Every structure is written in C-alpha cells, then in structure tokens.
Design a binder for these strands. Structure first.
Lengths: 154, 180, 128, 138, 98, 48, 41
RNA sequence: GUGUCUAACACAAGGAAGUUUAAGGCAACAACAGGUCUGUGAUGUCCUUAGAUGAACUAGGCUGCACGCGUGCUACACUGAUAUAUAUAACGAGUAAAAUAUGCUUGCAUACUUUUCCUCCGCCGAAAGGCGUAGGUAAUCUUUAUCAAUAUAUAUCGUGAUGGGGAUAGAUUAUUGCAAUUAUUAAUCUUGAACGAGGAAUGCCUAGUAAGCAUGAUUCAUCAGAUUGUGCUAACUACGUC
C-alpha cells in the first residue's frame, strides 16, 4: 500500500517520484507552518464549484488546493486560470435532467495563483500564456520530494 | 513459479469431477501473477474453457447494473474475499473457491424431461449462483459484497444448505428428479 | 443524559450536530455548514452532548445573520419586496409568510396566484 | 545507441525507446512507479519478472504514450515493453537468447507479443448502440 | 507552393508535373508534403417528407492539400508556376527565397 | 413593414425560399430536400 | 434497529455485529485498537 | 479427416488476420390506389383573387387541462452518496449590423472606427457573469503529446425515505433579444413529493460488441432530457434449433 519492492531504477528527486496526495498535504502543512499562505477571511465561507454545491469539509482545504495547484504547475509549465478552471472540473447533476461538466470557482484559483506569485513561487512572463515556476519554489519542492523519498526508503 | 497477487501459490490440485479439473484454471498458462489479461473468449465453442477462472469470477462479479464495467473493483472484491476466507480458515482461498465451484455445479437439470449438465456449464452456473447469492446478501444489508462472496464460498465449499448455490442446486436437481 | 433534545421540541440526539440542525431547516447543508463554522463546533460530534449555550449560539446565528460574515447572496428572504428591507425569515415564519405571499398574489391577481388558487403547477404539468 | 518499437490496443499507442543503460524505466516525464491502479501496476511489472534484473541492467527504457484510457494504455505499454525487450536482444545481444526470451514471454501470454484484434464498430441510425435498437411498439 | 484540390488524380498529375518542372531549371526542392485531409461531411436524412424508418446517409466532400517548396529566386518560381498550371487545382505561391 | 433581423424569418433555403430543414452547416443555406438533388453537382459523394 | 449507542478477527462489519453498533463506531474501535477500504491483515 | 471421394466441407498447424477478415455503401423483377401538391417558377383540375383564402402588421394561441395510451430521461442506495487526489479521449468545430467623433434642435443629421464565429491569456466577480486585450481563411491560434466523464486511491456517513431521491415551491443576480409577464435560459440560498427494484404484458442483443459512462455535431439571436456521430470503461451465454 504505502511502499512495495520493485526491480527498476527511479529518478528519486521530483514530483514524478512522489505520492501526489502525501506530497500535497505535506507541502500545504509546511506552507501553513511557515505562514506565508493565508486563507483568507471570505474564503472560509465560499463554495468550490457548482458541480459540488458543497465544499471540502476539512478547514485546511485552501492550503491543500494551493499545494495541488503547485503540483499541476510542476507538471504543466505555462498554464493559466481558464486551464485551472477546466483542470478542477467535474460533472454536475442537472436535477431530473442528465449531467454536464462544471468548473471549479474561479476566484479561489485566481487568489491562489496571485498569492503564490506574491510569495514568489511563480512568475508571469511577457512570453507565452500564464505563470510558470520560480527556481526557489522548484528547489523546495525537490527538497520535500527528497525528504519523503528518504522517509519511505529507510 | 506463478502466484496470485504475488501471494497465493495455487499449484495444488483438487480431485473434482475430472472434467471440472480440465475446465478450471489448473494449467500454468491459465495462471497469472494478478488477475486480468482478457483474451478473446468468444470465438469458438470451447474457447471459454481457456479463460482464467479468476477472470471468469471477476466478470461474474462485474455483472448487474451498477457493477457493469468495474473490473478493477470486481478484482478488489475477490482479493478482499480471499483475505476473509484465509482468516476464517487457514486454507488457500483459491483451493476453497475451486471446492465451492465443484460443489455448486448441478448434476441434472429440468426441461419440457430432465438432462445432464456440461462441466463447463456447471462451472459457469456455479460461479453465477455464488455471485448472484452474494449480491442478494449484499443488497440493503450490513454485509459487504466481499464478505458475502467469502461467506457464500465457505458455505458452498463446506456443503451447507444455507448456501444460496447449494439450495438452488438442490432445488434444481430435486425438481428434475421429481419429473424424471 | 446522552441523547438530549433540540429546537422547538425535536428529539434528535444521535444525529451529528450538522445532521440534527439540517433536520430543522438548512438541509441544502451549506446553511448548516456555515452555521457550524460560525458556532465553531465540531461537525463530527453527536447532537445530544451539546450544552444549551452551544445550541443557543446556533439559534442566535440562524435567527440573526446580521452580525456574522454572511453575504446577501447567501441569505434566506434576500430583499423582501418593500423599501423596508428584512432578511432571513426562516422556518415556520417563512412558511407563514409564504402563505401570506400566495394570499397577496391571489388578491392582486397574478398568474401564479391564480394557479395556486386553482391548484395548478406554476411550471405546469404539461398535458398529462 | 537506440532501438525502437511500439504497442497498440484500441486508440492507445505506447512507443518504446530502449537505449544502452543501467535499469531506468520511464513513462513520458514520469517514472514507471506512477501507473497507479494496483492491477495495472502488476500488468507492467509482469515483463520485468519474465526477463529478470540482470538482463534489464544494461538497458534503459523510456516509453511515450498517446491515446486511450488507463487499461488500454497499460496493455499498450506492456506490449511495447515485450517487443522492446526482444528488439534489444535482436539488435545488440543474440538471436538465440532472444528466442529463449520470446519462449518465456509466449509461455506467460500472447498479448505482450501480438496486439489486440478488437476495434470499434460504428453507430448506425435507429439505436444508441452499434447494433442495439430503440423499442418497437403496438 | 501549396496545391489544394478535391480530386486525387489531378493533384497527383500536378505532382509529377512539378517534379519535372523543378528539374527543368534544376531547382533545390523539399519533397511534397501532404497536409491532413479535411472532409466536408453532411449526414443527411433520406426522404423529403421524413417518411418511414429514419434512415440517414453520409455525404463527403474530401479536399486534399499538399505543399512543395523551393529555395530559388522569386522570378524563377512565378514563371515556373505559370508554365505548370492546369485549371482544376488551387495554387498558392509563398516563396520569397533567393 | 417592420423588420426582424434574427431568428426564423432572417433566413431561408437559397434555392426554394422555404424556411424548413435548412443546412447552415459550412454555410450551405439549402434545405436538405433541395440539397440532395444538387449535392453531386456541388461535389459531395456518399461512401458510408 | 437497536444497533447504535455511544457507551459500553479485524474487520468493521464483524465488530459492528459483535458489539451491536454502527460501522462508524466500529472504525473508531479499529482506530483505538491500532493505537475506500483498508488492509486488516 | 469427411465429401459421388467431384463441386466442396470439417478440424488442427502456420499466420497480423482464415466465414467473402469485421463493418459499411450500391439494392433487380414486379407491385402497393403507403407517404409527400406545407421543399421546389414540378403540376392538372377546383375554389378564391382588393370591406382578398394574396402580401403586410399588432396582440392571443401552438407548452391549455376531470383524463387515456406510445417513446425517452431520472430514481429507488453502501460494489453507494459526499469531498479531495490520480489518470486521461476520439470524431469535431470555428470571422451588414453596432459603437465612437463632429454640426444642428434629451432628439436628429453628418463624419469615422470597431465588435460580429471560436475564445486562450490578465484583471474583477461565491457564483453565474463582467471588463481589458492576443491568435485564428486554420495540422499553425482557440486546442487537442491533451479538450470528457465512468475509472481508480485516501478520507466522511453507516441501512434509518437515511446525509437515498430531486419532483414541487419561494425568495436573487445575471444572459440572449424590441419583447421573457404561461416559472425563456442561468446560477445562489432555502423548500425535500412520489418512489422500499415494478403486476398482466413486452424490447433489444453473440465480441471491443451488450451495458455503463461521457462528449462533438444538428437545429441556435435565444436551447438537449431529442437525433446523429465519436470515444473510454470491456460483461454474461449458447456458439445453435425449427
């Protein structure tokens, strides 16, 4: 479940070596510990998407979501907000009528995107579409990846 | 050599009806390290024989409405069921499952008259009976489908009349005898 | 002791606090979730071990949204017609007020009022 | 140096790049470990057992995946690994060892040597399925 | 030089002609690049009054695009183009080379 | 007169002026009953 | 029915049967013992 | 092997495939007083043709509702709902109104410039949505080495119409349009019906099918529960008989 023996060699330093959820939660917890990230205020009240109607029921969900976005950033380099809305999409039960796809709430995504940028982890360039990663953030993700990799290994 | 989930040895044999041993996945090439390979198993009349019995068991489990297309889930249900059987008695669950399939198969059936039953059909019916019984037990009750399947298998393997498969087989044979 | 009762003599107590509250009004569950958060109680806890003060706070939050960070778009009874605003009527008062609205519509004459008087669906049952 | 093969079930195509190496296995930008479903994890671990560690240990495998869902993609990857392993032993090592290896793979199953023959049948007017039809009535 | 047609044989005839044409002035060509086929598909109900079994038939206008390009001066390619033309194919000239 | 710039009266089959079953796909603007006569001369051919 | 209260082989359904309780209460007992689906082996 | 041991068939092996490989298209003879003159400047005859059965314009009506029968959708839960996470698809499809400046008497006239179909991206917005712009005649930009949802993984319920179900209704702010008022469409919060897996009957289906799960296209100023395509998840059962 957590760890199995395998014969092949692995890279052992990136998110492409890591359990996504464990990584996402750990970095979110680390970020909250650091206190760089803020919820803030109004975002306690909001809903996460009309495909849900509800909300994540965890109180630390915004940090989790921020962390989850940062992982998507490491996968996909120059992505923007409409891509994020589409990324976090699900199905929406239309009452008696059949389902159609429904976006996550765009303000929470935009707020995270801006907040990460304010905290220097991403950079919007004049080139291409949206925000890509800053090196310091990448090196930190790699360091956390390394911590987990050691932690499972020994 | 080949062990199911990398766990179950499944090299041991069962005496059965001899024809049934031919039908079940006794053969090395019918064995696999974890379920599912999905060859083309409709093509020729006896082609179904060549299918892995665990592949057949999961396919039967995958049957019915909400269950359709959830092959991995059907694999998880059988894997969980094997753990339960192992706990309930320290016997190899696959061997127990073969015993249940051997036990469950009807010897005669009834027609507009009464008839003997194909060994491949006996296996197909037995798996069907055990899974349908498991679903009936599952639906609107406390017990999980993995538990129900394990419980049905152990009861059928034992040869308990509380098994749905044994009860249905007994009734089918009894009606066939009643006519002829 | 352990399965103590809830608002307007309802016997809920082994229900979770959210599930108990929703079983009054708020069973779109967003309302309950925010009330739970405004109270700052654990939603996993079972209703019959709340003290009266926690219940009173919840009733206060439900009754009066004004001093809480609850926005107008969220609110029950959002604008309320006349120039004098009123908000969040809720419960039996909402049901009573709605009956008064249907009576008011009927007296004026509106299609919906008239359909309510006939006993016809507003969206229409369509032929059958 | 480099030898190339591919695998193809339904839409999905997995191309395998087998270079001279040291035992690394990738799927695009991602390690082989990240397949995720436990059943399909075993499906790609299967060829690794069939060729063992010491015949894997002088080659690196990188695989490039386009099209289909997970179960189809993994079977395409598995086929690509099978053909890949054989192509390396045919281009670099020896024909006799390749034949010996192929025998092992054949004994396990045909599906990592020969791809699927099943392909979709078009929808035709008068029903939701390819053949299945809307209900008749009186 | 881009060639677009709805007729396979005419476009292929043009291909042989341009290959010869290029070799006449001994030009340096990049081999003819066949671009992804676009089909104009109409799925059409049979019956003008919508009678009987619903019954649809699928009509296709399939256009072929190809591109062959040349590193040569502007005058040479336009003059070559004017000798090489036939009425049916659609020709576009994009060469600014020298 | 009092004109309407959108919806049903804004358009017709170019061939026959009828307002029904019009193919506006690819901007053809012909009703299919007229179109199936001319689809060959337009250049379409059916294969499936 | 009556299988639900707060006060008094590993698998939750068996625990829920044995003490006559809910599966949530069984899981809590499992968690206390330890000190989707899960592996009890 | 079987077969007049002829035309040919059966099984196994080889082979990517072994029935004409699987799927389409095309569809005789001779009919039907089947449907379509509301597709057509195809059309006979008949009515009518200026207090016009033409053209045109304003409302109302086509969804009316004691009620009956077809076809479809959604449910009745725990192999499930709820919330996060991980994966991903094929077929596609996309360019004459308005606004602004100037002159005149809030209005008009003249001049001049964008939008127009797809919207990345960046701001603002719970949300719908808005604003600012960029690329697109299109393997190039929307955008497709990734544009879906079921899958699958960890958490929350724990069999109780229950947190299943979403009928029904109230209160909003948006969107298209001159016009939304027979809830147009849209979201927000609340509202929480029948229904405990369907009687007599009866439909479709044999291999990537069946079933489930989606989505593009068609109509479209405004709208998918329809139709028509396309994919992924990948069953059962004979394998034939009159």
């Amino acid at each position: 479940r957590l760890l199995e023996p395998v014969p092949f060699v692995k890279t052992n330093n990136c998110i492409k070596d890591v359990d996504a959820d464990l990584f996402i939660r750990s970095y979110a917890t680390h970020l909250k510990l650091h206190n760089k990230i803020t919820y803030p205020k109004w975002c306690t009240f909001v809903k996460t998407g009309k495909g849900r109607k509800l909300a994540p029921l965890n109180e630390d969900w915004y940090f989790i979501r921020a962390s989850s976005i940062l992982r998507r950033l490491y996968l996909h380099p120059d992505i923007g907000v409409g891509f994020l809305r589409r990324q976090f999409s699900s199905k929406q039960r239309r009452g008696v009528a059949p389902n159609h796809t429904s976006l996550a709430s765009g303000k929470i995504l935009r707020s995270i995107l801006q907040q990460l940028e304010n905290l220097g982890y991403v950079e919007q360039n004049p080139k291409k579409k949206g925000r890509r990663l800053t090196t310091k953030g990448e090196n930190a993700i790699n360091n956390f990846a390394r911590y987990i990799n050691k932690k499972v290994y020994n | 050599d080949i062990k199911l989930f990398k766990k179950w040895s499944y090299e041991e044999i069962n005496i059965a009806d001899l024809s049934l041993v031919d039908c079940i996945a006794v053969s090395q090439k019918a064995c696999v390290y974890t379920p599912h390979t999905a060859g083309r198993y409709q093509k020729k009349r006896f082609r179904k024989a060549l299918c892995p019995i665990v592949e057949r068991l999961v396919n039967s489990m995958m049957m019915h409405g909400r269950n359709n297309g959830k092959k991995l889930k059907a694999i998880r249900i059988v894997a969980y069921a094997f753990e339960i059987i192992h706990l309930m008695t320290g016997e190899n669950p696959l061997q127990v499952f073969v015993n249940a399939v051997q036990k469950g198969g009807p010897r005669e059936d009834s027609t507009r008259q009464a008839v003997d039953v194909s060994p491949l059909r006996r296996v197909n019916q037995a798996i069907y009976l055990i899974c349908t019984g498991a679903r009936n037990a599952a639906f609107r009750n406390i017990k999980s489908i993995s538990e129900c399947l394990a419980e049905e298998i152990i009861n059928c393997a034992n040869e308990s009349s509380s098994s749905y498969a044994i009860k249905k087989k007994d009734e089918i044979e009894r009606v066939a005898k009643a006519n002829r | 002791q352990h399965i103590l009762r809830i608002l307007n003599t309802n016997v809920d107590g082994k229900e979770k606090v959210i599930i108990a509250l929703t079983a009054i009004k708020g069973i779109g569950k967003r309302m309950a979730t925010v009330i739970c958060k405004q109270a700052n109680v654990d939603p996993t806890k079972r209703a019959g071990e709340l003290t009266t003060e926690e219940i009173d706070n919840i009733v206060h939050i439900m009754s009066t949204p004004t001093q809480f960070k609850i926005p107008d778009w969220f609110l029950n009874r959002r604008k309320d017609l006349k120039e004098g605003k009123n908000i969040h009527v809720i419960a039996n008062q909402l049901d009573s007020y709605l009956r008064e609205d249907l009576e008011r519509m009927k007296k004026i004459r509106l299609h919906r009022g008239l359909r309510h008087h006939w006993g016809l669906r507003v969206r229409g049952q369509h032929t059958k | 140096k480099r030898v190339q093969t591919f695998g193809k079930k339904k839409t999905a195509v997995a191309v395998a790049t087998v270079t001279n190496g040291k035992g690394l296995i990738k799927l695009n930008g991602k390690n082989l470990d990240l397949v995720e479903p436990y059943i399909l994890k075993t499906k790609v671990y299967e060829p690794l057992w069939l060729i063992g560690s010491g015949k894997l240990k002088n080659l690196d495998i990188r695989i490039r995946v386009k099209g289909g869902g997970q179960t189809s993609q993994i079977y395409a990857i598995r086929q690509a690994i099978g053909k890949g392993i054989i192509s390396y032993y045919q281009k670099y090592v020896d024909e006799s060892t390749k034949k010996e290896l192929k025998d092992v793979l054949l004994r396990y199953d045909r599906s990592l040597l020969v791809g699927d023959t099943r392909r979709c049948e078009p929808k035709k007017f008068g029903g939701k399925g390819a053949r299945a039809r809307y209900q008749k009535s009186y | 030089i881009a060639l677009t047609s709805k007729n396979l044989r005419a476009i292929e005839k043009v291909c042989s002609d341009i290959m010869k044409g290029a070799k006449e002035k001994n030009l340096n060509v990049s081999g003819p690049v066949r671009l992804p086929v676009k089909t104009l598909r109409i799925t059409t109900r049979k019956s003008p009054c919508g009678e009987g079994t619903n019954t649809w038939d699928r009509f296709e206008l399939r256009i072929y695009k190809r591109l062959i390009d040349l590193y040569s001066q502007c005058e040479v390619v336009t003059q070559m183009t004017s000798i090489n033309i036939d009425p049916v194919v659609e020709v576009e000239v994009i060469i600014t080379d020298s | 007169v009092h004109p309407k710039k959108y919806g049903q009266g804004s358009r017709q089959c170019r061939v026959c002026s009828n307002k029904h079953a019009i193919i506006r796909k690819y901007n053809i603007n012909i009703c299919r009953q007229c179109f199936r006569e001319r689809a060959d001369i337009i250049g379409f051919k059916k294969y499936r | 029915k009556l299988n639900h209260a707060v006060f008094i082989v590993i698998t939750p359904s068996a625990i829920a049967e044995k003490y006559k309780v809910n599966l949530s209460v069984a899981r809590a007992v499992i968690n206390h013992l330890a000190d989707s689906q899960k592996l009890y082996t």
